[PDB]
Write an enzyme that holds these catalytic residues in place. Sequence first.
Site, PDB file in Angstrom:
ATOM      1  N   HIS A 113      33.894  14.503  -9.692  1.00  0.00           N
ATOM      2  CA  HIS A 113      34.484  13.254 -10.161  1.00  0.00           C
ATOM      3  C   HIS A 113      35.776  12.881  -9.423  1.00  0.00           C
ATOM      4  O   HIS A 113      36.343  11.822  -9.701  1.00  0.00           O
ATOM      5  CB  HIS A 113      34.655  13.321 -11.685  1.00  0.00           C
TER       6      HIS A 113
ATOM      7  N   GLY B  59      45.550  15.692 -14.533  1.00  0.00           N
ATOM      8  CA  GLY B  59      45.862  16.290 -13.254  1.00  0.00           C
ATOM      9  C   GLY B  59      45.448  17.743 -13.124  1.00  0.00           C
ATOM     10  O   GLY B  59      45.575  18.310 -12.031  1.00  0.00           O
TER      11      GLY B  59
ATOM     12  N   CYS C 133      42.348  19.004 -13.594  1.00  0.00           N
ATOM     13  CA  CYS C 133      40.975  19.177 -13.163  1.00  0.00           C
ATOM     14  C   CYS C 133      40.916  19.960 -11.859  1.00  0.00           C
ATOM     15  O   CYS C 133      41.728  19.757 -10.951  1.00  0.00           O
ATOM     16  CB  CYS C 133      40.315  17.810 -13.005  1.00  0.00           C
TER      17      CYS C 133
HETATM   18  C1  LIG Z   1      41.382  10.527 -11.620  1.00  0.00           C
HETATM   19  N1  LIG Z   1      41.703  11.838 -12.194  1.00  0.00           N
HETATM   20  C2  LIG Z   1      41.145  12.224 -13.366  1.00  0.00           C
HETATM   21  C3  LIG Z   1      41.413  13.439 -13.918  1.00  0.00           C
HETATM   22  C4  LIG Z   1      40.802  13.832 -15.209  1.00  0.00           C
HETATM   23  C5  LIG Z   1      39.519  13.404 -15.559  1.00  0.00           C
HETATM   24  C6  LIG Z   1      38.918  13.767 -16.764  1.00  0.00           C
HETATM   25  C7  LIG Z   1      37.553  13.273 -17.082  1.00  0.00           C
HETATM   26  C8  LIG Z   1      36.550  13.218 -16.110  1.00  0.00           C
HETATM   27  C9  LIG Z   1      35.290  12.740 -16.425  1.00  0.00           C
HETATM   28 CL1  LIG Z   1      34.060  12.668 -15.212  1.00  0.00          CL
HETATM   29  C10 LIG Z   1      35.018  12.305 -17.709  1.00  0.00           C
HETATM   30  F1  LIG Z   1      33.786  11.834 -18.006  1.00  0.00           F
HETATM   31  C11 LIG Z   1      35.988  12.350 -18.690  1.00  0.00           C
HETATM   32  O1  LIG Z   1      35.668  11.918 -19.949  1.00  0.00           O
HETATM   33  C12 LIG Z   1      36.107  12.725 -21.052  1.00  0.00           C
HETATM   34  C13 LIG Z   1      35.360  12.273 -22.274  1.00  0.00           C
HETATM   35  C14 LIG Z   1      34.134  12.828 -22.620  1.00  0.00           C
HETATM   36  C15 LIG Z   1      33.449  12.401 -23.743  1.00  0.00           C
HETATM   37  C16 LIG Z   1      33.973  11.405 -24.535  1.00  0.00           C
HETATM   38  C17 LIG Z   1      35.178  10.829 -24.215  1.00  0.00           C
HETATM   39  C18 LIG Z   1      35.862  11.261 -23.092  1.00  0.00           C
HETATM   40 CL2  LIG Z   1      37.400  10.515 -22.723  1.00  0.00          CL
HETATM   41  C19 LIG Z   1      37.253  12.828 -18.374  1.00  0.00           C
HETATM   42  C20 LIG Z   1      39.617  14.562 -17.676  1.00  0.00           C
HETATM   43  O2  LIG Z   1      39.219  14.934 -18.771  1.00  0.00           O
HETATM   44  N2  LIG Z   1      40.946  14.987 -17.292  1.00  0.00           N
HETATM   45  C21 LIG Z   1      41.694  15.825 -18.200  1.00  0.00           C
HETATM   46  C22 LIG Z   1      42.761  15.322 -18.908  1.00  0.00           C
HETATM   47  C23 LIG Z   1      43.457  16.159 -19.762  1.00  0.00           C
HETATM   48  C24 LIG Z   1      43.063  17.471 -19.864  1.00  0.00           C
HETATM   49  N3  LIG Z   1      42.035  17.977 -19.176  1.00  0.00           N
HETATM   50  C25 LIG Z   1      41.365  17.167 -18.353  1.00  0.00           C
HETATM   51  C26 LIG Z   1      41.520  14.627 -16.094  1.00  0.00           C
HETATM   52  C27 LIG Z   1      42.318  14.352 -13.234  1.00  0.00           C
HETATM   53  O3  LIG Z   1      42.642  15.476 -13.610  1.00  0.00           O
HETATM   54  N4  LIG Z   1      42.832  13.886 -12.041  1.00  0.00           N
HETATM   55  C28 LIG Z   1      42.559  12.660 -11.488  1.00  0.00           C
HETATM   56  O4  LIG Z   1      43.057  12.318 -10.427  1.00  0.00           O
END
Ligand SMILES: Cn1cc(-c2cc(-c3cc(Cl)c(F)c(OCc4ccccc4Cl)c3)c(=O)n(-c3cccnc3)c2)c(=O)[nH]c1=O
Lengths: 305, 305
Positions: free
Chosen positions: B41, B143, B145
Amino acid sequence: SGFRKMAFPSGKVEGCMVQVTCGTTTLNGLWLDDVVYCPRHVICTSEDMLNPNYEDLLIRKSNHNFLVQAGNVQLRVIGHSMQNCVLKLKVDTANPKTPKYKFVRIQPGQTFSVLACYNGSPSGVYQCAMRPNFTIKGSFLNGSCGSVGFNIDYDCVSFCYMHHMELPTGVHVGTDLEGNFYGPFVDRQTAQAAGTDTTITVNVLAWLYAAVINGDRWFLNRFTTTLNDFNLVAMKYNYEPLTQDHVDILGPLSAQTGIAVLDMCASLKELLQNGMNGRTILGSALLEDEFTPFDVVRQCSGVTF
Amino acid sequence: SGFRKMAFPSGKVEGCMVQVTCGTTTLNGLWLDDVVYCPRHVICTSEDMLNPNYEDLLIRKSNHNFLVQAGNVQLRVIGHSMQNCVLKLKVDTANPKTPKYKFVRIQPGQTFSVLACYNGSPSGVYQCAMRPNFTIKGSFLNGSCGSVGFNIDYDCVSFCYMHHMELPTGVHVGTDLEGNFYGPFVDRQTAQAAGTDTTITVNVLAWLYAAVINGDRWFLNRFTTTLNDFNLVAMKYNYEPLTQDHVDILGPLSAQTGIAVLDMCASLKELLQNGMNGRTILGSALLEDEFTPFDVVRQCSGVTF
Ligand SMILES: Cn1cc(-c2cc(-c3cc(Cl)c(F)c(OCc4ccccc4Cl)c3)c(=O)n(-c3cccnc3)c2)c(=O)[nH]c1=O
Ligand SMILES: Cn1cc(-c2cc(-c3cc(Cl)c(F)c(OCc4ccccc4Cl)c3)c(=O)n(-c3cccnc3)c2)c(=O)[nH]c1=O
Ligand SMILES: [Cl-]
Ligand SMILES: [Cl-]
């Protein structure tokens, strides 16, 4: 989200751990630049530990009696001296893995990470706190002496603890890296009991703020209190008194959550007076006091090193 | 003595963490030999995450769209492919800090250490467990991930977890390093709820053995039970059923303490039926299930890496 007992990444300290052998004894040393630090009781036999005269014992030791091994790399000891309760072995090679570092003496209530080692080899890492009675509640087995505690700020390792002994009660005592014991303990196998293990009030409050930030809100009540009234309650439950300085250190958590510090004290007072009624806070069934205000902000903000 | 939630020393994994940037997105990658692993992702925009077609999104990406930074060292990406839910970026330089390693898919109930990272920079290390519902109760902020979970055996790192998402409930889900999610989760921002979070019975028993070894004996009673009877009680309290395989894995702890496994089950049954009456075990007011039998033996014996 989530809130975990989290240690600093240990790699910068792993690269400093060595094995120190004197005669039949082997324990851990800390190799920084061209000096190796270790507990001075590495020179004692089992009988010496009952009433050692360290200066006299040192008369009979030369550089070549101290063996220092890092991996299989054998280091050449070119000098030695005693500083308080630690030995400083000058070696002929600077540790190429030396991090930016400093030595600090911490106050009771402050937390740090421990890298538990055996034979100069790291075994695990965990978080603990300087208790108000100057013990720590670690996890240490024989052979762990010379394991160190530390904090990391950006790229700088602040070494604050060297492990020396386990008391008959099973709690742990040690020195700063200048070799001065925390608290009244001495490195002799003689009767030594710890004082009262009180609870670190400012840390409990910090952890309640962490709970709020994470969505555990059930303990928030609609009372407030004063510093003097809260401290009357703190005393009854063997909590440390809260000061204005503590109130100020909690300011950032108060600002983030909108909960005045004295309001949170009122919630803590009700928790102390009525217990938790089978409920939990951040997965704990007791009030946790080994997160500092800075631990909570760092973990809840994402600070890296 | 003492018993602590203890993570493996993280240094061997710190040397593998890098920053991966695609377009506006930046998260963490794992650099082993000449491959960088990260969640797929990283190629999504905010709108893509609602219903992404990863193969279609990948059509529009070339090697030069993936930016990999390790320190300030910028790595040159010479190929890329998708394996299940992870991206594999081939770089032109082997990581000089690569440890001995392997990829393993762990079972529910097994524990591992997490190195939480942000912008390719390690922030802290902590222990957790694969829950029976294939979530983990971590501590992760945006951040994070691409942060990984691992075990270390001697000098070999066994990578078992890559962090991908936080569910609306605040628990954490991810993949093995082959990119297959643990449990039924998919990397799409769409409704996904976790199943029942049951308690890992074999781990609770292991922790009760750790308590005995450490001198916390008050919960030992003079009853025994059978496997079938205990499991009737396990079911009522949302504990996982205990098997003969679990009994055998606890054999070494039984041998060390002299307490037959079924005797310990009888003590656990009484604890489940009557609670802990304001008492504590190894400093906890609840029954802890994120120590495996192997964790307890390693910590209580001094195994190093
Ligand atoms: C652009 N971007 C994105 C992320 C990033 C992405 C995610 C993330 C990625 C994908 Cl594919 C999701 F489908 C997603 O849906 C979560 C969800 C599932 C079911 C129902 C509602 C929901 Cl909301 C979430 C994330 O969960 N987190 C995160 C946040 C807090 C703690 N742990 C993880 C972070 C990142 O870290 N860096 C970066 O640059
Ligand atoms: C030869 N030798 C010795 C040690 C070693 C020494 C000690 C140790 C060292 C000195 Cl100077 C002592 F006065 C001492 O009295 C503890 C005590 C104080 C008050 C009343 C009764 C008692 Cl008993 C103990 C130790 O406590 N531990 C340890 C064990 C378990 C957990 N944590 C620490 C280990 C070692 O690690 N390696 C190695 O080679
Ligand atoms: Cl934890
Ligand atoms: Cl802990």
